[PDB]
Design a protein around this ligand. Structure first.
Ligand code: HEM
Ligand SMILES: Fc1ccc(-c2ccc(/C=C/Cn3ccnc3)cc2)cc1
Length: 392
């Protein structure tokens, strides 16, 4: 049979097959869960080529009749969300609202992490570091960043186990949740009490004549999409980074003893992270040579992030965490090119503060079950354990 993607939902180890593929066929034909054919790209060189050539288009993946990685979970126009934000003149305001350096935000993150951890310690081991630490921390962070009530976070969070599904077919619950969450964000924009964060700023610009013909639809869409992408990405990254750290007691102890090394540690944890369950999809808008393959206009290309990030040509001894690499931020964990993650700095800070807090409170943190007992979520856009049971 034609090789099927994805290879494994496990986020604790890279399949031996990725390295064989990278060496022998760094661009290779595969079949996606929809039955469509696609080109899987797995070397640093070819992954960077695709992501830096805008003729491999994110927007066009949404075209009717295209070969699909998975079913849309947002309206087709929303696949071009960042381009819509740019065209509306809103990129700078969005970026300023989501920087980790906003006054009080870092201290809020620290206080929230420490309170979550104190609750776990009071209750006693075992603790679930995903559902009762990493995801709540992500959720609290994004409510603060958006300027919305903390008590609204849990309901918004509960859309995400459906919103970020990677499904062969359209998902009826995804539309129900999308429409409801859009209505929530539209109400937020009409709420005079919402004056801070991303939604407070968007509410102001919505009433500013310089933005008078931006649609109410776009303003609410920004709220739903930034909450969803930010929460799912940060909660999932921190969860799987904590596994990688628990798997490395020598590194855990070093970062505990020398917390000034945590930023370098988080950068390597980003590099080796397996959180993205599928390659990043793009549709060719011209015939383009990629390695030994002439990709044809209309074909689907999938950029495998761990293909690039474990490439031994670019990252020697790729499975080893090294805090002194000469090319440390040159990984693709945040993508590359036109669609580079707009939340990258906030995502770094969320993980840095979360790990700093956990190592101080739980220096002896260890898995409370054998690692093979973790239950890896399937048919999802991220690789995550359903529960992360730890002791300390
Ligand atoms: C460790 C945390 C995160 C990781 C690993 C991550 C990863 C990524 C990656 C790989 C992309 C590129 C997708 C592509 O090119 O197809 C991306 C884009 C995106 N990220 Fe993140 N992200 C993180 C945190 C965040 C946060 C905190 C936010 C917002 C608050 C965010 C919002 C977005 C959005 C809206 C896009 C789409 C950009 C576009 O279409 O041009 N992400 N992210
Ligand atoms: F009910 C729902 C349905 C869908 C969503 C939803 C889906 C996708 C994105 C954004 C993906 C872009 N992206 C690429 C890499 N990381 C992130 C945002 C929100 C939220 C609630």
């Amino acid at each position: 049979v034609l090789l099927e993607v994805p290879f494994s939902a496990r986020g604790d180890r890279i399949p031996d097959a990725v390295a064989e593929l990278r060496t022998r066929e760094p661009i290779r034909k595969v079949r996606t869960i929809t039955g469509a054919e696609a080109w899987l790209v797995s070397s640093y060189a070819l992954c960077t080529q695709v992501l830096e050539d805008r003729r491999f288009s994110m927007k066009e993946t949404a075209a009717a009749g295209a070969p699909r990685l998975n079913a849309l979970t947002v309206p087709p126009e929303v696949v071009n969300n960042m381009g819509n934000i740019a065209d509306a003149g809103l990129r700078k305001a969005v970026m300023k609202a989501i920087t980790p350096k906003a006054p009080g935000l870092e201290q809020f993150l620290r206080d929230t992490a420490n309170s979550l951890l104190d609750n776990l310690i009071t209750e006693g081991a075992p603790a679930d570091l995903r559902n009762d630490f990493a995801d709540p921390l992500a959720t609290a962070l994004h409510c603060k960043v958006l300027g919305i009530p903390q008590e609204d976070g849990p309901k918004l969070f509960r859309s995400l186990s459906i919103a970020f599904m990677s499904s062969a077919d359209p998902i009826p619950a995804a539309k129900i949740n999308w429409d409801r969450d859009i209505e929530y964000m539209a109400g937020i924009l009409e709420n005079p009490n919402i004056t801070t964060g991303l939604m407070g700023e968007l509410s102001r610009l919505r009433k500013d004549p310089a933005y008078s013909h931006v649609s109410d639809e776009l303003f609410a869409t920004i709220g739903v999409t930034f909450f969803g992408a930010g929460v799912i990405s940060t909660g999932s990254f921190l969860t799987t980074a904590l596994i990688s750290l628990i798997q490395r007691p020598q590194l855990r102890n070093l970062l505990h003893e020398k917390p000034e090394l945590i930023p370098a540690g988080v950068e390597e944890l980003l590099r080796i992270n397996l959180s993205f369950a599928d390659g990043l999809p793009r549709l060719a808008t011209a015939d383009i040579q990629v390695g030994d393959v002439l990709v044809r206009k209309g074909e689907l290309v999938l950029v495998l992030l761990e293909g690039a990030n474990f490439d031994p040509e670019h990252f020697p001894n790729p499975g080893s965490i090294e805090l002194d690499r000469p090319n440390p931020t040159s990984h693709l964990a945040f993508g590359r090119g036109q669609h580079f993650c707009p939340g990258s700095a906030l995502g770094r800070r969320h993980a840095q503060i979360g790990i700093e807090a956990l190592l101080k409170k739980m220096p002896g943190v260890d898995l409370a079950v054998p690692i093979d007992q973790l239950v890896w979520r399937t048919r999802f856009q991220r690789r995550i354990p359903e529960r992360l049971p730890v002791l300390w």
